[PDB]
């Protein structure tokens, strides 16, 4: 099918703004119990964990290379 | 498919410069091409 | 100037024994030039190279015009 007529500005605004509610803002922000950095709720920190996971990955690769 | 089957030998023989020289009408073709200021008399 | 200085001095053998040496020198000089440019390194001595180019063109023009003079002399 094809549009009968061109859309007015008002209809476009009312359609693209109100019903979609834009982006609903909740609070995901929580302070890390360890380093005190701001991170997401119900989730592990992105500071004191990713570095320890990379150090654990390097230690696992070094142990796997030393065992072989 | 397509109507085009590229060949260099056929192109150089048929559309070539020597072929244009062998016929007076071809000389007229080169003539009008040089009159139009074509940079290439042959593709 | 330099061209005229070459033309006023008349030697048949010495000329080739000169500009062939300068040409074979330009060969190695432009060789080092090309090897420098293709090595992704700046030109160590562009000035001397340009001077060698201009001088080689000059001497080649001298030999050319001298040969032209000789041929014109033998023709007429």
């Amino acid at each position: 099918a094809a549009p009968k007529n061109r859309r007015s500005i008002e209809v476009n605004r009312c359609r693209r703004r109100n019903p979609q509610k834009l982006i609903k803002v909740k609070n995901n922000i929580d302070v890390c119990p360890e380093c005190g950095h701001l991170k997401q709720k119900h989730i592990l920190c992105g500071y004191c964990x990713x570095x320890x996971x990379x150090x654990x990955x390097x230690x696992x690769x070094x142990x796997x290379x030393x065992x072989x | 498919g397509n109507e085009y089957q590229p060949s260099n030998i056929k192109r150089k023989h048929k559309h070539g410069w020597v072929r244009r020289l062998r016929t007076p009408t071809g000389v007229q073709v080169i003539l009008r091409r040089m009159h139009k200021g074509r940079k290439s008399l042959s593709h | 100037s330099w061209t005229c200085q070459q033309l006023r001095n008349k030697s048949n053998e010495d000329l080739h024994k000169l500009w062939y040496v300068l040409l074979k020198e330009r060969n190695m000089l432009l060789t080092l030039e090309q090897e420098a440019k293709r090595q992704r390194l700046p030109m160590p001595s562009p000035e001397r190279l340009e001077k060698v180019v201009d001088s080689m063109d000059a001497l080649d023009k001298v030999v050319q015009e001298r040969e032209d003079a000789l041929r014109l002399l033998q023709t007429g």
Binding site: - | - | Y20, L23, K24, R26, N27, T31, Q34, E35, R38, Q39
Partner: protein, 87 residues
Amino acid sequence: XXXXXXXXXXXXXXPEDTVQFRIPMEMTRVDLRNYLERIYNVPVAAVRTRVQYGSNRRRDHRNIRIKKPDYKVAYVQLALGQXXXXX
């Protein structure tokens, strides 16, 4: 001016009696041998020549496709007892 030398450019390793050169396209191997023998005073055992077609590049200002000048390269084998090393 017609010829030049290239050593550290080629990735192929042939330090023993093998030298690489850029030559003119019209010059035959024999004339190259004689020229290299008489002018630079060195013996030449063999000559192997090949033609390198020039790469092309466009120009956006005039909207015109252009091509770099074609080249020809040669590989000379000299007399025994010589080693070519250059940077």
